Structures are given as structure tokens and as C-alpha cells.
């Protein structure tokens, strides 16, 4: 088997292969995540001849935890499958289900081991993992190709994620949090910054307290498009 050192330090102390993996994230579709009290939400950027279902970038990992990603879609699918395996394997070892921190720590640990083990280039993805814990607290974390992880109130990754995070930093108030409708509107506003003409080109899903994941179809999405643009005038 192949024992070559793939990821190594440079003259100036950079892990170039991890840095090039983060360039592969910045080309991928703009994924955005937002937290609330009762609800947690994810949304993604977007051809006429495709099945939307197959190229879905929002994926459930267990009954309580799901995730979004941005970057290389093949690399994403392996991390998602191995996350899904670890979620059930966690229940098999200690009965109680997975907290959002534990699965994020695992995905981070998996990403980090590919930046340091021989033969293997890093995973060219950043993820946005969301859900509800044992006690029922809502969570949103973010991993990246290096295998660092941090909790967030809201965050963006992908194309123009600076301009989305700049928008989120301002707009994330206590007013937008309180209701289920208002948190969803905030995600669509944020995606409308980067999405050149929104509506139809926005994937979007939600998670509530005890309930499982729920993707909103383009009919449900275009309802909230009307509720945003009317309120701007007033």
C-alpha cells in the first residue's frame, strides 16, 4: 500500500494541501446555517434536466442530527456515510443517541486524520452540522478540511461566504429568532445576497425540538419569498 507523505509543512509553516482543500470549499455552492430557540435551519445555493433529489446537499445523519456541506460532492458523501455509521455505532456502544458536538468532533477527527496520515489527501469540504441534544438544546457547529470545529449562532460556507457572514453578523438579532417563520426568512435573505434572482434556486430544510428533519419544497419556499419582499417596503 501507498505510504507517501501527502500533507506536509512548507517553508513559511503552511499545510499547503489543507489550504488547497479550503480553496475547493470556496468554489462549492453557498451553504448557510442558522440557530433558534424552537427550530434549526439550513439552506444551499443552486439545470432544468436534473432530479433535485439526487444533487441534494442537505443530509440527515441520525433522527435528531442532520448536516449541510460545501465543496467537493464526492468527498462529502463519504464523510456523510461514515458519520451515519458512527451515529448508529454510538447507539450500539452506549445506548443514548449522539449529541451534535460528538458527531462534529468525529467528522473533525476524521478530517484531521486525513491531513496527517500517509497516502491520503484531505477531504475538500466544510460542513454545517445541526440538531437537538439529549437535554433538548439546539446546536449549530462548523467543520473544515483542517479538522478544526467551533459552535456558531449562524454561519456561511462556499461562494461569497464573506458577504453572507457579513450580512449574518449584522442581521442576527433576538427579533429574527423568536418565531419559526422569522428564522427561515433570515436564511432566505442571506441566500438572496449571493443567489442571482432567488426562488427555485434555493434548497432549504428545517429541524424542530422533538421532530425529525423536513425539507421545504419550492411551493413552500416561494411563500416565504412573498413574506420577505412585502415587509422590506413597510
Partner 1 sequence: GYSFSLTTFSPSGKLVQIEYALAAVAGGAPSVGIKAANGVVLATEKKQKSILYDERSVHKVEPITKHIGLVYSGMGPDYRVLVHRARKLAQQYYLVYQEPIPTAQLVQRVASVMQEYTQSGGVRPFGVSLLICGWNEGRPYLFQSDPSGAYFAWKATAMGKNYVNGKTFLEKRYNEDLELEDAIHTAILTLKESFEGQMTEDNIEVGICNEAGFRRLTPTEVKDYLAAI
Partner 2 sequence: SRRYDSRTTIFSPEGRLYQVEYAMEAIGHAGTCLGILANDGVLLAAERRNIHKLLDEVFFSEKIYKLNEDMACSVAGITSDANVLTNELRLIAQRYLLQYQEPIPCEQLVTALCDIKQAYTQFGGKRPFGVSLLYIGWDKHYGFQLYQSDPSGNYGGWKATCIGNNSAAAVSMLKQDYKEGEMTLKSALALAIKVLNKTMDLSAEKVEIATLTRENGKTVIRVLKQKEVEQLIKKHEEEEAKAERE
Partner 3 sequence: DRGVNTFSPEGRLFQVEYAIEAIKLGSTAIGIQTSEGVCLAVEKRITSPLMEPSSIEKIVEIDAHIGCAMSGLIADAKTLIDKARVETQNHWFTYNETMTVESVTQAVSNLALQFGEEDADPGAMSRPFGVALLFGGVDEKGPQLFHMDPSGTFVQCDARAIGSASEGAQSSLQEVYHKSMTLKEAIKSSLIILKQVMEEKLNATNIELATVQPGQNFHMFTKEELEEVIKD
User: Would you tell me which residues interact with partner 3 (CB under 8 A)?
Assistant: 3-15, 108-109, 111-113, 115-118, 141, 146-148, 150-155, 165, 168-169, 172
- Shortest distance, CB of residue 99 to partner 1, whole angstroms? 39
Q: Which is nearer to partner 1, 10 or 118 (CB)?
A: 118
Euclidean distance between CA atoms 143 and 114, whole angstroms: 14
* Angle separating helix axes 180-194 and 161-171, nearest 10 degrees: 150
In the complex, least distance from residue 166 CB atom to partner 2, rounded to whole angstroms: 22
Burial group, residue 51, by CB count within 10 angstroms (0-12, 13-18, 19+)? exposed
Residue with smaller CB distance to partner 3, 172 or 224? 172
User: Quick one: CA torsion of 86, 90, 93, 99, rounded to 10 degrees?
Assistant: 160
Site string for partner 1, 1-40 (x = CB under 8 A): xxxx------------------------------------
Name the minimum Å distance from CB 121 to partner 1.
13
Query: Is 124 among the residues that bind partner 2 (CB under 8 A)?
Result: yes
Closer by beta carbon to partner 1, 52 or else 119: 119
Binding to partner 2 (CB under 8 A) within 50-69 occurs at 50-51, 53-55
Q: Write 193-201 long-range contacts (CB < 8 A, 24+).
A: 193/160, 193/163, 193/164, 193/167, 194/30, 194/45, 194/159, 194/160, 194/163, 194/164, 195/30, 195/45, 195/46, 198/225, 199/225, 200/46, 201/45, 201/46
Q: Find the shortest distance in angstroms from Cβ 118 to partner 1.
A: 10
Given phi > 0 = left and psi -120 to 50 = alpha, else beta, which region is 200?
A: left
Q: Please give the DSSP secondary-structure letter assigned to residue 122.
A: P
CA angle 79, 158, 52 (to 5 degrees): 70
40 binds, among partner 3, partner 1, partner 2, none (CB under 5 to 8 A by kind): none
CB of 218 to partner 3, least distance (A): 28
Residue closer to partner 2 by CB (options 4, 230) is: 4
Binding site for partner 2 (CB under 8 A): 1-2, 4, 6, 17, 20-27, 47-51, 53-55, 72-75, 77-78, 81, 114, 119-124
Q: Which residues bind partner 1 (CB under 8 A)?
A: 1-4
Amino acid at each position: 500500500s501507498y505510504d507517501r507523505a501527502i500533507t506536509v509543512f512548507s517553508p513559511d509553516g503552511h499545510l499547503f494541501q489543507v489550504e488547497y482543500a479550503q480553496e475547493a470549499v470556496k468554489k462549492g455552492s453557498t451553504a448557510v446555517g442558522v440557530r433558534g430557540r424552537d427550530i434549526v435551519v439550513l439552506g444551499v445555493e443552486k439545470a432544468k434536466l436534473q432530479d433535485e433529489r439526487t444533487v441534494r446537499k442537505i443530509c440527515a445523519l441520525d433522527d435528531n442530527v442532520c448536516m449541510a456541506f460545501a465543496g467537493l460532492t464526492a468527498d462529502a458523501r463519504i464523510v456523510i456515510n461514515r458519520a451515519r455509521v458512527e451515529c448508529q455505532s454510538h447507539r450500539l456502544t452506549v445506548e443514548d443517541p449522539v449529541t451534535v458536538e460528538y458527531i462534529t468532533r468525529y467528522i473533525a477527527s476524521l478530517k484531521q486524520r486525513y491531513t496527517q496520515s500517509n497516502g491520503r489527501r484531505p477531504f475538500g469540504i466544510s460542513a454545517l452540522i445541526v440538531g437537538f441534544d439529549f437535554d433538548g438544546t439546539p446546536r449549530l457547529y462548523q467543520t473544515d478540511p483542517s479538522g478544526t470545529y467551533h459552535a456558531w449562532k449562524a454561519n456561511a460556507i462556499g461562494r461569497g461566504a464573506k458577504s453572507v457572514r457579513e450580512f449574518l453578523e449584522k442581521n442576527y438579532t433576538d427579533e429574527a429568532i423568536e418565531t419559526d417563520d422569522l428564522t427561515i426568512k433570515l436564511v432566505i435573505k442571506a441566500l438572496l445576497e449571493v443567489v442571482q434572482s432567488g426562488g427555485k434556486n434555493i434548497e432549504l430544510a428545517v429541524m424542530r425540538r422533538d421532530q425529525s428533519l423536513k425539507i421545504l419544497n419550492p411551493e413552500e419556499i416561494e411563500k416565504y419569498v412573498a413574506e420577505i419582499e412585502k415587509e422590506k417596503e413597510e
